[PDB]
Amino acid sequence: MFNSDNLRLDGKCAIITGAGAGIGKEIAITFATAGASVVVSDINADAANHVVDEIQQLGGQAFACRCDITSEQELSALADFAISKLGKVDILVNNAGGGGPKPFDMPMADFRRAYELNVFSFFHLSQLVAPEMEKNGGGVILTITSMAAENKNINMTSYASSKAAASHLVRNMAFDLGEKNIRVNGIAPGAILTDALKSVITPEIEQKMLQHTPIRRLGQPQDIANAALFLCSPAASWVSGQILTVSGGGVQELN
Amino acid sequence: MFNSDNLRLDGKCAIITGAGAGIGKEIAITFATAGASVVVSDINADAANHVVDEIQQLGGQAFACRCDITSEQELSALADFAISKLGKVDILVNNAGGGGPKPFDMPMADFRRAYELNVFSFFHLSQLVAPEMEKNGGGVILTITSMAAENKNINMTSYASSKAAASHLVRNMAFDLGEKNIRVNGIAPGAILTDALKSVITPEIEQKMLQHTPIRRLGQPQDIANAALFLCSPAASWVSGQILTVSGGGVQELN
Amino acid sequence: MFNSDNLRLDGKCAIITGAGAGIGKEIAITFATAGASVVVSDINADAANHVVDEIQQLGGQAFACRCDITSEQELSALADFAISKLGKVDILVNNAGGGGPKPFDMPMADFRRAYELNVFSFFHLSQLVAPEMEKNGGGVILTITSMAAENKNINMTSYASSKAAASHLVRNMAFDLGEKNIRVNGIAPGAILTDALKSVITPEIEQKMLQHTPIRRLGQPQDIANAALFLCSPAASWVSGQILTVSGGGVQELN
Amino acid sequence: MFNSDNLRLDGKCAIITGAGAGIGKEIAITFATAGASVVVSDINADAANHVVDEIQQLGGQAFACRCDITSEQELSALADFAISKLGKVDILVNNAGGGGPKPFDMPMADFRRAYELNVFSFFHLSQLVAPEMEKNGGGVILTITSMAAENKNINMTSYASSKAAASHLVRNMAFDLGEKNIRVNGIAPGAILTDALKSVITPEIEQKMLQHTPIRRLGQPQDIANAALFLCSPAASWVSGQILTVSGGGVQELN
Numbered sequence A, B, C, D: 001m002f003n004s005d006n007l008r009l010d011g012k013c014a015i016i017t018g019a020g021a022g023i024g025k026e027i028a029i030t031f032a033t034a035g036a037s038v039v040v041s042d043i044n045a046d047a048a049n050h051v052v053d054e055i056q057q058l059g060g061q062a063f064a065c066r067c068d069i070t071s072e073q074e075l076s077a078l079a080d081f082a083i084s085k086l087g088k089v090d091i092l093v094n095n096a097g098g099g100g101p102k103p104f105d106m107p108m109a110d111f112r113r114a115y116e117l118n119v120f121s122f123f124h125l126s127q128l129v130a131p132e133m134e135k136n137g138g139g140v141i142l143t144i145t146s147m148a149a150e151n152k153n154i155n156m157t158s159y160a161s162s163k164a165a166a167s168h169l170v171r172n173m174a175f176d177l178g179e180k181n182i183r184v185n186g187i188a189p190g191a192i193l194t195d196a197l198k199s200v201i202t203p204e205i206e207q208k209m210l211q212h213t214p215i216r217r218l219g220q221p222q223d224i225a226n227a228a229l230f231l232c233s234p235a236a237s238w239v240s241g242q243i244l245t246v247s248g249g250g251v252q253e254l255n
């Protein structure tokens, strides 16, 4: 029997990483707007504060944090800030990441940054949060991975390998955290219409993309926010260790 | 931003196969309860009708039909009836199927049966239903596949390969139909506490199953129903060609 | 330590299906030429006889059979012919199959033929052969599946779903047959330069193909024959339930 | 037609990491015995030198080098030495790696270590070696990955995700390098009877492992060596981006 309250986050406290823009922002708004008290972490503090305002006008409860996911020290801080403002953490939404297209001969420092962004931060923040969740009797961690973790193409060595590590960590973390009654899932988005996408997309690339997408349209952040809501809601209580690909049933690549 | 109406099925018409018991019955109820008019199909008309009464008790619109999915004559009948009672078709939830464990030396008749129940029936009904949806401007086809489509084990030649063919149909069919604005997805459930499982499970197998499930509890029909609602709802508008697995982050196998 | 005799089929008897042309032919020649006595089954008897001649001049041992894989009755016959001519069967190479691109609204008879060709024949011949292999203490079955079993595109519903069932049967048959000390593997070829490929390939399609293939070249039957030799040789004695994709590291599609 | 010369490595130059024992030692021997001049690298120079003597005893060309793959300074040294002794590089068999089972609460230092051993080292050496190969007109890079790259279980966060990143590198790297005519592949072995396994295995775990292996015997170094020879030979010329799994058709896990 359908029950609208099971698709809502009433009384849940969520840390949302890289929430000042794009997919991240929409998840924050969609979550707070579904009953969750949200902490908005972003490196661009201005963006982070704007979202909080947006949420508050909407009748939401939000706090801002100027964290850089790529800093162990700023991570444990964000984690402390969250428990202080919220009181507890129930949902971790690891959205921040990145890296992008890089040539085979890129410097190893470039190769390494994608792992800091996409794997190490995600895993370390999970470590910092899990103990709280366990203490409350359960929680949910969701990471925004990528379809690059499944695709094969040129100039994607760093990005694609890092997101693959991110998606597989998910399948395995689901075991270690399952004992603590924590669920871990990820969403793998396709061509989402974001500034991030705009910086690397050419008018022809877009077209090639659209012609390989059955549902002829480019993704909007809400598509990802809608899926994040479901995966983090009590309606998905027996869903763990999964990666949901939101891509119109197609494939969108640059090369 | 969270919009509750996108998670409901108001004014949609759904045909559901094998909805007399287990998983299908709950999808039927959850859907009718979420605003859809449903056609409860099953090879057991008594069961089909009982589900119909319950839906009506809950205040929903529903019609019962006795259809054996393994007959093309019976599938057309099912499509016709659905149309004459509903006036249109917006959603197909192809749930009936089965086959189960079988020795390698099984008669070809038993091997082929698995395909009749899980592949040919499902493909053909989509052929029947597609044109109706197409004219309404789109629709959603959903199939209840299986973890066996990915697992490997002894005594599963017929069952596992057929479910694997069904899961790959979803991926390709998503292309042919993306043009008619029809989305196609599937759900592969783990051990769901239903009589089909109760028929093959034992206390030892039971324990071994829970022994490998991170979220330590067997699945409930509602879990599948919850996922089916999201997948068939407006909120999953850009999700096509996917097979979502509901297994508590683990695997439940017989061996 | 390398040992050339481990990559040879000296004293092995192999049934090669659809061996009168393309990939099939090359496997026959490459096998007989590596020490195996070969039975050449094909529906085009003339082609089947030509290959036998070719093999004999080369100093090979071969027999022809005019079998249609899509006939239970011709299958048990082929199996009997093989044991009579060869004395025993050690290697089953299920190469015959087919079907090709079909539209969503194809007749169900067309949908069903791909399964006869790609799944049912393969599974039934395996049943007919396994008992011999068991009797000898072991054997190897190899099927030629396809990359369509992994790819998603339009007009591939029947072909792609059937080959997927074929590839997954492999993963599972490896269990049932493993007790009998039988190994089951498959090879999934990409754009192999065959008349079969020529009938559905356009000059532009070819180019698109080549530009998505890292090893810029189209496959030759020998590539598949070389891989079949390894998979069926004693050097691969602990390799079972695998599908080796030979595709220059790329993807080759029509749509 | 079968051509034995295509299965040999005559006049090729191969660098092999961690070749002092186990799997790497056997690849070294098999390769030198198949006609290649090899550079036995290992963090244990005694071991490296012992392998060199054996290869020379068997009549092959080989050189020992003490390299700890987790140091960029040491990898360049390894590439330089290989070139000054061999004159060119035709094959890279990146075998050294490791990490193993680790609790979820492990220090980030241990999590990151897994990446140093399985991902960064391997990617960087390919950067070093690629230009050498490129000039000879092509080459082959092969990595010894793992089944953990696909399995899911408890205590494998660091180990499994890193191997998963390495396996996906192979898939993408195959693209960047397909142009230089370099092929990239990997082998994911099951339980191979080597001391690394002997360090983690127990008689009970032993039994459970064989309990799920169709071809009921633990793997031997030669099995991996046999597959590596084929993959790095002229016979696999159109095989790139693949990860071949040698596991006897089953899975050997610790839990």
Ligand SMILES: NC(=O)C1=CN([C@@H]2O[C@H](COP(=O)(O)OP(=O)(O)OC[C@H]3O[C@@H](n4cnc5c(N)ncnc54)[C@H](O)[C@@H]3O)[C@@H](O)[C@H]2O)C=CC1
Binding pocket: A017, A018, A019, A020, A021, A022, A023, A024, A041, A042, A043, A044, A047, A067, A068, A069, A070, A095, A096, A097, A098, A144, A145, A146, A147, A188, A189, A190, A191, A192, A193, A194, A195, A196, A197
């Ligand atoms: N836009 C697209 O097409 C797709 C994006 N993704 C993934 O989605 C995630 C984010 O996507 P978008 O919203 O498009 O990105 P975006 O770049 O538009 O916005 C991300 C937000 O993250 C913040 N940020 C960046 N680095 C940070 C750091 N080191 N520490 C803390 N905050 C940081 C930025 O200030 C920004 O406000 C990434 O993990 C990306 O890999 C995956 C598939 C598609």
Ligand SMILES: NC(=O)C1=CN([C@@H]2O[C@H](COP(=O)(O)OP(=O)(O)OC[C@H]3O[C@@H](n4cnc5c(N)ncnc54)[C@H](O)[C@@H]3O)[C@@H](O)[C@H]2O)C=CC1
Binding pocket: B017, B018, B019, B020, B021, B022, B023, B024, B041, B042, B043, B044, B047, B067, B068, B069, B070, B095, B096, B097, B098, B144, B145, B146, B147, B188, B189, B190, B191, B192, B193, B194, B195, B196, B197
């Ligand atoms: N419960 C479980 O453990 C799992 C079930 N499944 C799948 O869920 C689907 C439904 O199974 P459950 O609800 O568990 O089983 P169930 O046996 O409890 O219910 C099946 C319903 O379908 C009807 N049905 C059977 N054959 C039919 C036919 N030939 N034509 C029309 N209707 C027919 C039955 O009469 C019954 O009412 C199947 O596709 C099965 O493969 C997949 C994974 C797990």
Ligand SMILES: NC(=O)C1=CN([C@@H]2O[C@H](COP(=O)(O)OP(=O)(O)OC[C@H]3O[C@@H](n4cnc5c(N)ncnc54)[C@H](O)[C@@H]3O)[C@@H](O)[C@H]2O)C=CC1
Binding pocket: C017, C018, C019, C020, C021, C022, C023, C024, C041, C042, C043, C044, C047, C067, C068, C069, C070, C095, C096, C097, C098, C144, C145, C146, C147, C188, C189, C190, C191, C192, C193, C194, C195, C196, C197
């Ligand atoms: N050519 C290509 O690009 C690729 C082919 N494949 C697969 O390889 C297999 C064969 O490929 P090709 O050698 O290119 O085909 P082909 O059509 O060139 O030759 C196949 C041989 O099979 C025979 N044959 C057809 N139906 C038969 C039947 N019903 N019973 C007995 N014999 C029959 C034909 O007479 C012919 O001599 C098929 O399973 C196909 O799905 C997979 C990937 C690529």
Ligand SMILES: NC(=O)C1=CN([C@@H]2O[C@H](COP(=O)(O)OP(=O)(O)OC[C@H]3O[C@@H](n4cnc5c(N)ncnc54)[C@H](O)[C@@H]3O)[C@@H](O)[C@H]2O)C=CC1
Binding pocket: D017, D018, D019, D020, D021, D022, D023, D024, D041, D042, D043, D044, D047, D067, D068, D069, D070, D095, D096, D097, D098, D144, D145, D146, D147, D188, D189, D190, D191, D192, D193, D194, D195, D196, D197
């Ligand atoms: N034997 C098994 O059960 C399996 C092993 N593997 C993989 O096979 C590869 C090799 O392992 P085995 O032969 O089994 O192990 P092993 O422990 O028997 O041999 C490893 C060799 O690599 C050397 N080595 C270790 N660290 C090194 C470093 N930091 N730099 C340079 N050389 C180093 C060791 O001294 C030793 O000589 C690894 O990538 C491992 O992940 C994968 C699956 C199974």
